[PDB]
Design a protein around this ligand. Sequence first.
Ligand SMILES: [Mg+2]
Lengths: 61, 294, 50, 48, 48, 277, 90, 49, 145, 48, 49, 252
Amino acid sequence: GAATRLAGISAAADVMRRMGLTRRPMSSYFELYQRIVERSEAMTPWGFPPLFQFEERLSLE
Amino acid sequence: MEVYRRITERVRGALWAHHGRLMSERQFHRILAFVYNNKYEYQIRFDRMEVVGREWGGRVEVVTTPAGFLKRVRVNPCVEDLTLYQQQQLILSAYANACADGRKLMEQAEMNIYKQFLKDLKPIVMGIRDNPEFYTVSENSIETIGGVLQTGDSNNLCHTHRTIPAAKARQPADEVRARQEWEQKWINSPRGQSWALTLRGKTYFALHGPQYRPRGAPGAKKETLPLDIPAPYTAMDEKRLLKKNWMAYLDNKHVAEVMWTRVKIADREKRQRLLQETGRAWHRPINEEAINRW
Amino acid sequence: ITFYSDRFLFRDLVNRREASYANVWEMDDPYRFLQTEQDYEDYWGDNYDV
Amino acid sequence: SWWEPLGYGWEQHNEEQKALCDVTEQRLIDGSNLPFGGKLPPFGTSYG
Amino acid sequence: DDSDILRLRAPLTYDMDSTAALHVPTHCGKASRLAGMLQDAGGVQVLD
Amino acid sequence: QNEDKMVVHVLEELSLRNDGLVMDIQYAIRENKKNRRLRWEFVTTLLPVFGGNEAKVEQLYSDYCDGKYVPNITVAVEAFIAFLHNATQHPETYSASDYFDIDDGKSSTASGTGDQPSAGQYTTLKLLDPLEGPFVFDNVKVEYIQTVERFRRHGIRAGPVMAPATGFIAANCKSLNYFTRRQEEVVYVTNDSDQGLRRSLENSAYHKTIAANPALQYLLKARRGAALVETFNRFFYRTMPMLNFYQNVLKHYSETIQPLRQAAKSSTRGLARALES
Amino acid sequence: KVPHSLIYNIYPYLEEIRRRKGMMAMHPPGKDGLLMPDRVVDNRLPDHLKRGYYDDVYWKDFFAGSDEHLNEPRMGLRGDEMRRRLEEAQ
Amino acid sequence: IFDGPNVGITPYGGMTRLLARPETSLKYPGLAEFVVLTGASLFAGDALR
Amino acid sequence: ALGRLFSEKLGDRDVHQWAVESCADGEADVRQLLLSLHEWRERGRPPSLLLANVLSKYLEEEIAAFNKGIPENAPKLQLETSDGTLAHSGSGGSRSGTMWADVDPTTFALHQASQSTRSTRCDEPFILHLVKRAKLGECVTNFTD
Amino acid sequence: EGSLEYFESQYRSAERAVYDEEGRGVRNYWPSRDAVEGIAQEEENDAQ
Amino acid sequence: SHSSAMERAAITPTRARWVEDAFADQPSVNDIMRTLTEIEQLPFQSTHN
Amino acid sequence: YHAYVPKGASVQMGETFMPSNIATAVFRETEAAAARADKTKEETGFFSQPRLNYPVSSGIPALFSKDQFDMQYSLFHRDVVETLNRHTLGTPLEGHNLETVIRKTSFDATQAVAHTAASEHFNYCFFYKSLRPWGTAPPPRLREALQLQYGTNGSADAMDEVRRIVWVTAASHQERCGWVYLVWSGVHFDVVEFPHGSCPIASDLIPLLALNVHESAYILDYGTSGLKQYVENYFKACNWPLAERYYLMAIG
Ligand SMILES: [Mg+2]
């Protein structure tokens, strides 16, 4: 049950481009790509603790 | 109702597809309403008469208005001896035969209705395709951002038809005026004189003189030139909306677009079915490059 | 606050689908809303005439 | 009254005029002066 | 024998087969309504 | 020589001075060539005169279509006759395809012509319905139809129901086509002046077998030749529509040609002195 | 379940269930309502044709300042109207 | 299974129409008689085709 | 293909001049074929049979030369109006050299005008115009000032 | 009815005033400044 | 997910051919029976088997 | 309905000219077509033939019949792709660009199969992209660059000179197996001839125009001796503005 991640990234860059999210066009795609490539090297990279994953009372530094 | 609504939407959608005209919702529903009332009138007059179906021999007679309302039942005393079940089935099948006859009449009447309706759409429909700018391309011709591509195959097979005379315009109005010129020409001539004293003549003047209708008598009192609604040359509902509020403009625009799309999809379905029936098309997609490769 | 079942309308629905009418006036007259006398009493209470 | 201040189709119409018209008669619309810089503002910034 | 299969093509009468025609819609709806319609017509009339 | 023209010469000259007119003649020619009906009528009308190969008849059809052929008046008349014969001997095919108006015996009044119009006779030769006929544009085709019907129904004779009088090639002239300058090659069969249709009829080998049919007797004797003239023209209008088509073309050409030359020279010289200046 | 308060909305539906008998339940014989395209129609013209086209129907110079309907927008225009154009251009 | 001349009766159930559509005569000429005379089963594939 | 055959043969010389040439005093109205030529070259359209007849009897040697080597079953280039309509989706695209059924006028015009061969008016002094075009480039309009 | 009549009348007059002012009989696309901006004396005559 | 191999089919194409040689356009059951009878006698080496 | 209609046939109007026999034959063909479509769907490898930007249902104008071009597209080329796929799977070259297959199999035996196939696939692709159906007139900037090199004191002499030199190079290739290119060395233009199983990318040039000098290409139409006529026609049908924009991108 793990699909391939290309459609997802081309989509998520597409949205930020068609939404007006960034003043300069590339920034959307670059940031989204970069942030993934850095996490690729991390132990258990694609899983996250449920509490620290997002906005919650206590957070990470 | 249905057959009519399909065609009316065909007209509305085509109206905005080809030229930038929108038909007022008011208008669109009033067309339909007229078909409806037509049918209603036909019902009014259809209930004044009766249809007789009959079962076994003439033993079982059923008298019923074409709408299917049951009026009288005559029965041989022979039936009285059967069973309640068979009595029931017998009268029931007589009733069915009545409904058959009535429904035959009715369907003739309906064909009549459809014809009047078409005739009434004709100034609009023709109104869109009889313009100096109206055109179509073959459906199988690829379409790209700039314009439409040539379909390659069988350079004989593609013939462009033209509705309009290319030299100076001859409109339907001119043709009706021609008709009344020949009417008066025939009338005013000898041998058109003696014909106007015949029964044929007075029949003709009965039906087709409006000018002779006494004041207050029903029907048109002049002869009317055919309606002219040239589509690209007449602003309809988009002009009022574009002045008043942009939001309603965008929404009516939207509707016309959606209807057009829907119509086109239906035409694709009928096409597909017709293609499977003759066995040129399979029952599941076998060619996915015709879809996925864009 | 009554909550009807989904098919609640079925009886009436087959009664309507199967109705037949001698002429069209009978089909839709203004007063087919009314059967018992109670109805005739509530529909005209206002005109002291009728 | 908010539609005219932003020349809407300006880059297109500029293109049309520059390509198909003589330089003697053409009216060219400049985007720098136009309200947002002739562009669509970045998402959250424009109050809507 | 052939003449008998010739016979089968003849439509249903009630004198040979003792059975009414099937016509299926109108048996669908009006089968349970029949007593109603009939007694609204004031019952049948037994003639001779 | 700038005087005598053929039809092709006219279309290729006019091709320069009227765009739309030529576009219309040519579209129409295409649509008439597409018809199965007008072809079937041409073929099965001229078949008996040659009596021969359908190759020559079909060739004559295609050539007829361009104006490159008009039938000779002799051939015309004996085609008329041939038709009357083939219609009377076996009526089944030619009363179910070539139409006659049948007498209504539920209508009876006292007159010489009207009574032979009332009982067991052929009243008139019928033209093709507007769908199966010669080309008309789809603008007006509806009104055209309505008019044709409203007229035939109530027995009005005028407009589209009446047949135009068609010309043919004279006996002494060997010419194949219509010419713009030469009017004496083209012959009309009129009521008053006749081409010998009677004298060709009575002296024909088919006269007694045609005099047998009770239904055609009115179409022979009614107004006298005014029944037999009308019958004639009507036939070749319903069979070979395009003789009149091209006729009206060349008529129109010879009419409007010189005004267009005036215009042409005037505007051309306009940009000419405007150019050198 | 359906709330008692909301049932009135079904009434028009239920209404013309009842009113559909005969002649209003009728659909035209032979006619579906879906008419597929078959041929290809184009009535478009070269401009010198559609210059003098409508002049016995409407006024002369029917297509004058019309840009979509003409490939040449300026034809037929009398001078000062042509001037209006460049005048708002500068 | 549209059968029943095998039980000595004529087939019932309306499928006869489907079998006699000009379409079926087109795609599978002779199939109609095959199934009506011989009681023989049809399956998903053939119902689809 | 017809477009560039023409634009090649005509070459430099005046459009109007050629249009007074191709018409002797009696041939056709210059206004008409001028109109149709304008609508055919830019705003790419099917040529009116007027313009097609003129062009046919003008370009006949270049068309005969473009048609000279072709194999049997391959598309030729022919101007014939024998059939009524002008829509070049009708001919097979074999009437002019067009590959398209229809191209909307504005886009076509931007395209062929993006081709520098399309002739700019240059009411300026010629050499000065060309020098400016070389030194400043087309990037002179990069600046809004 | 009767607005339209008047309206159309004055159009006809105004146009045969612009397109040829001198009644020579041929259509002129290069009219004088006075025939273009000049008012109908008919309207005046009608007030009178 | 689909293929022609995978749908359940009684009339798979040779079967269609056979059927239309047998039952197509035969105006009785008797014709059908002597047609069949004539077919069962074909050798194993005949082209048409 | 497009999906359901098989790959080859066209969807058109009923004239009702069909006898029942051929009407059944058609459905049979369609059935088999569905079958072979099902097997082609799994036989599909990594690489695939290019979509053609122009309709070839009739021939490519002034150049090819339907059968010539289609014998290239749907016979030799489609084969080349079969081989390429067969030999790029099971190897370190699985699932990379056309390039990095062309480029990393260069100049060597034992990958010779893969390289030949790949470079062939490219040559064909670029060939189709090199033909514009009614032909184009070569654009001013390219005309200028070409003049500075080939032009000897004549107007756009560079064009007839290039279209001459190409003919020459084509006739000077004896094998009748291969490709003639107009390419940009990076310092100058020139016309090269590549043998079968070699491409401009392996030799790191930048290609502008491709010409197919395989005999299979002109044999159905121009015959055995008809190469000159062939090339001459190719210039009626070639695509210049492509070569131009590629040239300008190479420059910057
Ligand atoms: Mg109840």
